């Protein structure tokens, strides 16, 4: 007999991921201050094809990076670092408001840094299609 | 607008102190924000106390009353002797009337306990300055107005629990020790009439409420009233069944009890024995019958966190681990209470099953007390034979991941290395291990029958999971010492083949990384298994050789830190030549070592020949141990001969990012190498040494030429950085050496000259920015092992880094955090190894010497404040030996008293209350002085002057008792010291009792 | 979305400005600045049974700048009590903050948090921290710079003030971010010859 019994990244690949470290300038106080530590993550939109940065903190999982990884960005070194990338953005919606920063983020290696600099324009070329 | 408050000229708006208050508690944003420093400029003000009175009785809100008896609590610590009479007596009228109007309105009653508490604690700080003197009636009428009101008992048995705690609790360091001991003394002399209405309610009383608040007053009673009031008493009984039952006062009751059960007992007394029993036997009853039987799962029970299960779960571990540890002897010899001692032992397995890492440690922590007394007392252990073998089944499966194991599980179930270093179950696993030892060692069979069947049950899955094997491969090794050599011969053979057959059926690199960690460990945990089987420790080196090419970065690393691990144990087996082998092992190892080592990182082949570096330093013939040094130093030294020929060509290589890394990773290697070999590293210094130097001035004119042409900034970069640590590296490896060094002799007649001509010039004429704390810390190990030997050496390092490192740190105690902590390391030991170099300072620099200590003392970093306070102890010592000479007389003259002054300051101004041992211990060394040779006047004199105008809130008499009583006991350090403390607890009120510094007389 | 009232209390430089910063921006701030009475600052934790918001009250430690002191714990509703594990005047004061604390606040859940484990001379060993085992408080080992475990503090406190015991924090939902030049270029240069601090960590 017949017993009975008792994020919003669905629709995105993952085309790049990456443990790193995000800073964000502070113009007025003049200095650099973290923003996040956790895995960088290049998502493609399935209905779009527009490829975003996401990355979120350890453990809390908040988001300390959200924005379209524009055409325009340029990627430039920072004076004390040869593993880290410095560049502006205009629109990051990680803690609400699209605002604009300059944001700087450091992997554990040279090898790491260089090739997130080959995905990150990768990703440029194809949000440019 | 809520400003009109500050403006004490017109009267007080209490309708708007009172809105002032609740946007402050019940607003936010810019408006809470403004009312915060509004409110606390209205507490500031020294006249706010006179508007207590009205807010008490014209407010609405229970908050700004509170904070008007915070204004009342500032005046009554700090100024309520220069008040009249005319105020004392009314304030306390008035709180004593709001007090009794709250307790007739059983609204407020209910509601505003946070006033009614507050209220209360106000009360008692008039207590501490008024009863029993001026007030012997308090205790009596508490007494008689309990009767008159269920609410004014149980309120008084709320201000008799914060008198306990302010006068026996928290006293020690807020009042005086004659106000404590006359505090202490007054409430000793009435407690019989307290505990007589505190026991009466217990016997009659319904009201929980009230009975709660009566064994909360109790508690803090029981930390200091004679014995009898506990056992020539009924209460025991009381506390041990009538109130165990009832859940609202079974918290408190259960607390009270291990007070009790933590008294020592007079062992030679009966009754009390019988009694302590009882009450113990009473209270595991009522848990049986009215919480939980003993069979519960209080595992699952804490986890579902209903009620107050958490608290009381962790309330009862504390009440049978404190009664036990001290009472179990009470139990194990009488039959008739062996039922009772297993059952609450019993409990504590159950508890010790629960997921808590904090109660987990305390139920462990008696393990540990037990296990050990069952090591060591006779006819003891076979009472708890069945404890003990259920606890080796808690500890096995609950073992925590020691720190040898690298690798982890992550949330997307794969094995990764782990980041950060698991610093706080480090000591969780050092504690489960030893109890675990001792555990296999009362009884070596029980153990190893676990271990082999949890073993069985993993091979046939019916228990496979990463978890199960990790606990069990943890508590294997960890148990390594408490077997014979043939019990653990078969018993380490079998758990081998065991986890080498899971290896092989397990497939996927995770299952792959959990095994290769398990049997890791476990193999480094047996040294004594693998020296006896020379064809085991050979085979298991060359698995981990293997280990060091896999990709998995976890497996490599503990590869690496396994091999050192083994060769600290087993070094002597690689020396010797064994039987079927045609040359000793270390010879294999260093010719293979290219190849060996290919795959792993810088800092993992360092450890490499670290590892290397331990088994040659067994050859004690000098001849075989140097050839052998050589070897293995082979690689290094060439592409050190071959960079030092492209140094004296053109030092423009020396640009060259990878130039850079492969000369730091050569000085690496060789510190690596010194690191474990020590005076036998000798040999291949001298190889090195004159062009190593050559090369830190070189690397010194680039770093600096970086500077200048690019700015400061410079220091930043990768490139000064990657310089910047060769220099690093050098002072590494020549402090190293320098601190293992047997042979001074060489130390002082070949290195030190070289070396100070090097680094001292250099580290002066840098700008700070560029300037290496790393010189003064080589500098601090110069002294240290050869100070001695060279006296104008130490002269010489003095002249080059004392003013310019002083001007560094003399501008705050913030920037160049190392350079002031290695500065003041450096000072210390010259001081003690040298200080003729002191003597020709001129006047001037050792003026700036002395600026330079009391500087010290001002630091809130204690790496600084110790050794500022330690150099003065040691300057004045140093001074004292001199004798009745120009010098010593001089430094009196000059700088006595600036130590002195210097000395009190950071003694009372509440900055610096780390370092008050050592500061009064440098004052009683000071003062001393002067009382062995008048010279006495003079120092009353200065000091009273110094104290009338540092403290002038202080009367001449009070600065003069405690004079007095200071200099009589300048040889007496704890009275010494507790004169001090009276000092610092007046100098924060005005009108203090002179006479409490007649304490110890 | 449910809000609770947490008050953060423990002697000066012991680091509950820089963790309560941490939890705030991410960013860890190595000055030392005083703070003065209280600084309140919401904060919200996403969870699988909704966001939960605490409001924290973060007090000064400080003695001439305890401005309300106790005043700021009234309807409390949980609380944290920092000291410092390189510092034994910290833990030995810890009695005294709880005395404190309990007076007004009688029945709350506390965590009781010894910061700067990362610090490599430990001077309060694990083996002496017990006073909260008599006090029911929860004990954890933090590290502000390191992050180690500086998110428990809050989990345990969600937990018990939710009344949930298998609460876990969750990843927010991530919106799609939006398509898209003169102070820029120079904004860009300065912070490209402004250093990025702590280069030697391993991130
Ligand atoms: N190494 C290390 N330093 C820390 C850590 N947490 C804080 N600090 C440092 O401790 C110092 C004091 O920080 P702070 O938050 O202001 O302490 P506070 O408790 O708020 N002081 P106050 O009570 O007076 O406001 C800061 O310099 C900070 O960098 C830590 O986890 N590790
Ligand atoms: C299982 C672990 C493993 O191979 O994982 C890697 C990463 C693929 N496994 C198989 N064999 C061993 C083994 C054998 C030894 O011979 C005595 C010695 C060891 C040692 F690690 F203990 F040295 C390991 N492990
Ligand atoms: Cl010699
Ligand atoms: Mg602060």
Redesign the pocket.
């Known amino acids: 007999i017949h017993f009975e019994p008792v994020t919003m990244e669905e629709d995105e690949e993952v085309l790049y991921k990456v443990r790193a470290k995000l800073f964000r300038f502070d113009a007025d106080a003049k200095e650099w201050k973290e923003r996040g530590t956790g895995d960088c993550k290049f998502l493609k939109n399935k209905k779009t094809n527009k490829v975003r940065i996401l990355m979120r903190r350890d453990k809390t999982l908040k988001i300390c990076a959200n924005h379209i990884i524009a055409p325009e960005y340029t990627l430039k070194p920072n004076v004390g670092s040869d593993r880290s990338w410095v560049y502006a953005c205009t629109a990051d919606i990680a803690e609400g408001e699209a605002e604009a920063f300059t944001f700087a983020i450091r992997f554990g290696s040279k090898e790491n840094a260089d090739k997130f600099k080959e995905e990150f324009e990768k990703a440029q070329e194809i949000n440019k299609k | 607008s809520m400003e009109g408050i500050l403006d004490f000229s017109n009267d007080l708006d209490i309708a708007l102190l009172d809105q002032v208050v609740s946007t402050f508690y019940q607003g936010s944003g810019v408006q809470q924000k403004q009312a915060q420093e509004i409110l606390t400029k209205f507490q500031d003000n020294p006249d706010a106390w006179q508007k207590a009175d009205q807010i008490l009785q014209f407010s609405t809100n229970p908050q700004s009353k509170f904070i008007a008896l915070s204004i009342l609590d500032k005046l009554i610590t700090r100024k309520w002797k220069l008040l009249p009479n005319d105020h004392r007596i009314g304030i306390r009228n008035f709180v004593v009337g709001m007090i009794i109007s709250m307790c007739q309105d059983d609204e407020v009653f209910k509601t505003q306990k946070n006033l009614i508490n507050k209220s209360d604690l106000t009360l008692v700080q008039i207590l501490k300055q008024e009863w029993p003197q001026n007030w012997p009636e308090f205790i009596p009428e508490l007494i008689g107005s309990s009767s008159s009101s269920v609410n004014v008992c149980e309120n008084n048995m709320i201000v008799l629990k914060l008198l306990s705690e302010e006068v026996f609790d928290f006293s020690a360091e807020q009042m005086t020790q004659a106000k404590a001991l006359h505090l202490k003394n007054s409430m000793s002399k009435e407690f019989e009439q307290i505990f007589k209405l505190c026991f009466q309610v217990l016997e009659q009383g319904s009201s929980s409420s009230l009975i709660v608040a009566t064994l909360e007053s109790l508690l803090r009673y029981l930390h200091w009233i004679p014995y009898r009031y506990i056992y020539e008493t009924n209460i025991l009984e009381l506390l041990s069944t009538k109130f165990m039952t009832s859940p609202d006062t079974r918290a408190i009751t259960l607390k009270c009890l291990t007070e009790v059960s933590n008294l020592k007992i007079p062992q030679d007394n009966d009754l009390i024995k019988r009694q302590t029993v009882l009450f113990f036997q009473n209270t595991l009853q009522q848990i049986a019958t009215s919480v939980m039987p003993v069979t519960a799962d209080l595992k699952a029970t804490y986890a579902n966190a209903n009620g107050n299960d958490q608290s009381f779960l962790q309330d009862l571990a504390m009440f049978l681990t404190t009664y036990l540890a001290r009472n179990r002897a009470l139990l194990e010899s009488d039959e008739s209470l062996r039922e009772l001692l297993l059952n609450a032992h019993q409990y504590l397995i159950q508890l010790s099953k629960i997921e808590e890492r904090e109660l987990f440690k305390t139920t462990l922590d008696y393990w540990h007390n037990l296990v050990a007394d069952l090591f060591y007392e006779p006819l003891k252990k076979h009472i708890y034979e069945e404890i003990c073998s259920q606890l080796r089944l808690v500890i096995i499966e609950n073992m925590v991941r020691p720190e040898e194991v690298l690798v982890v599980e992550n949330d997307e179930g794969e094995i990764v290395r782990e980041f950060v270093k698991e610093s706080d179950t480090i000591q969780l696993y050092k504690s489960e291990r030893e109890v675990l030892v001792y555990l296999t060692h009362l009884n070596v069979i029980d153990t190893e029958e676990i271990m082999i069947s949890k073993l069985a049950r993993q091979i046939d899955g019916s228990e496979w999971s990463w978890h199960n094997i990790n606990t069990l491969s943890w508590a294997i090794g960890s148990i390594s010492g408490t077997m014979s050599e043939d019990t653990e011969k078969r018993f380490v053979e079998t758990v081998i083949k065991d986890l080498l057959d899971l290896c092989v059926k397990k497939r996927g690199k995770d299952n792959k990384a959990v095994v290769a960690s398990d049997i890791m460990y476990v193999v480094g945990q047996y040294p004594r298994f693998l020296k006896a089987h020379w064809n085991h420790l050979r085979t298991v080196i060359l698995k981990l050789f293997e280990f060091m090419h896999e990709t998995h970065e976890g497996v490599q690393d503990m590869a690496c830190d396994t091999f050192i691990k083994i060769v600290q144990k087993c070094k002597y087996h690689f020396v010797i030549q064994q039987p079927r082998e045609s040359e000793p092992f270390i010879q294999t190892i260093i010719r293979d070592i290219q190849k060996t080592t290919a795959d792993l990182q810088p800092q993992q082949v360092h450890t490499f020949y670290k590892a290397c570096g331990i088994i040659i330093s067994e050859e004690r013939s000098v001849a075989e141990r140097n050839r052998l040094l050589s070897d293995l130093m082979q690689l290094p030294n060439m592409a050190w001969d071959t960079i030092v020929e492209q140094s004296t060509a053109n030092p423009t290589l020396l640009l060259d990012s990878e130039t850079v890394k492969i000369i730091a990773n050569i000085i690496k290697t060789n510190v690596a190498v010194c690191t474990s070999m020590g005076a036998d590293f000798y040999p291949q210094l001298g190889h090195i040494y004159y062009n190593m130097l050559q090369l830190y001035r070189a690397v010194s004119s680039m770093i600096s030429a970086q500077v200048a042409a690019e700015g400061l900034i410079a220091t930043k970069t990768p490139k000064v950085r990657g310089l910047r640590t060769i220099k690093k590296e050098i002072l590494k490896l020549v402090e190293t050496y320098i601190s293992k060094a047997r042979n001074l002799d060489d130390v002082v007649k070949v290195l030190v000259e070289p070396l100070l001509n090097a680094v001292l010039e250099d580290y002066m004429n840098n700008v700070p920015d560029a300037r290496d704390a790393e010189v003064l810390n080589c500098m601090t190990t110069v002294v240290e092992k050869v100070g001695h030997m060279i006296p104008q050496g130490v002269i010489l390092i003095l002249q080059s880094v004392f003013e310019c490192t002083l001007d560094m740190i003399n501008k705050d105690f913030t920037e160049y955090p190392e350079h002031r902590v290695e500065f003041y390391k450096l000072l210390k030991v010259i001081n003690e190894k040298s200080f003729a170099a002191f003597l020709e300072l001129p006047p001037a620099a050792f003026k700036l010497f002395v600026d330079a200590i009391c500087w010290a003392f001002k630091h809130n970093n204690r790496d600084v404040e110790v050794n500022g306070l330690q150099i003065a102890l040691d300057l004045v010592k140093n001074i004292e030996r001199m004798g009745n000479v120009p010098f010593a007389n001089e430094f009196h003259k000059n700088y006595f008293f600036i130590f002195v002054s210097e000395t009190f300051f950071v003694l009372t101004d509440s900055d610096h209350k780390s370092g008050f041992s050592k500061q009064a211990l440098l004052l009683m060394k000071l003062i001393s002085l002067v009382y062995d040779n008048s010279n006495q006047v003079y120092l009353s004199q200065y000091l009273a002057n110094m104290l009338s105008n540092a403290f002038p809130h202080l009367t001449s008499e009070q600065i003069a008792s405690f004079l007095s009583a200071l200099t009589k006991q300048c040889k007496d350090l704890v009275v010494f010291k507790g004169t001090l403390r009276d000092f610092l607890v007046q100098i924060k009120e005005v009108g203090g009792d002179p006479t409490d510094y007649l304490f110890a007389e | 979305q449910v809000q609770f009232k947490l008050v953060?209390v423990?002697?000066?430089?012991?680091?509950?400005?820089?963790?309560?910063?941490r939890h705030l921006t991410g960013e860890?701030?190595?000055?030392?600045?005083?703070?003065?009475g209280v600084e309140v600052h919401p904060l919200v934790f996403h969870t699988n049974r909704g966001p939960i918001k605490f409001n924290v009250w973060?007090?000064?430690?400080?003695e001439k700048?305890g401005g309300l002191r106790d005043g700021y714990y009234i309807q409390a509703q949980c609380a944290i009590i920092?000291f410092?594990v390189?510092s034994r005047v910290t833990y030995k004061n810890v009695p005294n903050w709880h005395r404190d604390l309990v007076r007004v606040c009688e029945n709350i859940p506390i965590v009781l948090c010894g910061?700067?484990?990362?610090?490599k001379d430990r001077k309060v060993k694990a083996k002496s921290i017990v006073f909260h085992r008599k006090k029911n408080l929860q004990y954890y080992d933090?590290?502000?710079?390191?992050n180690?475990n500086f998110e428990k503090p809050f989990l345990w406190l969600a937990r018990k003030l939710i009344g949930d015991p298998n609460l876990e924090f969750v990843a927010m939902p991530a919106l799609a971010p939006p398509e898209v030049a003169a102070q820029y270029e120079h904004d860009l240069e300065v912070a490209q010859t402004t250093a990025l601090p702590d280069e030697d960590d391993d991130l």
């Not at chain 3, 860890?28 to 003065?36: D, H, N, S």
């Not at chain 3, 910061?115 to 610090?119: G, S, T, Y």
């Open positions: 953060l423990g002697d000066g430089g012991t680091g509950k400005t820089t963790f309560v910063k860890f701030e190595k000055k030392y600045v005083a703070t003065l973060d007090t000064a430690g400080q700048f920092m410092d390189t910061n700067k484990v990362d610090i933090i590290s502000a710079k390191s180690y």
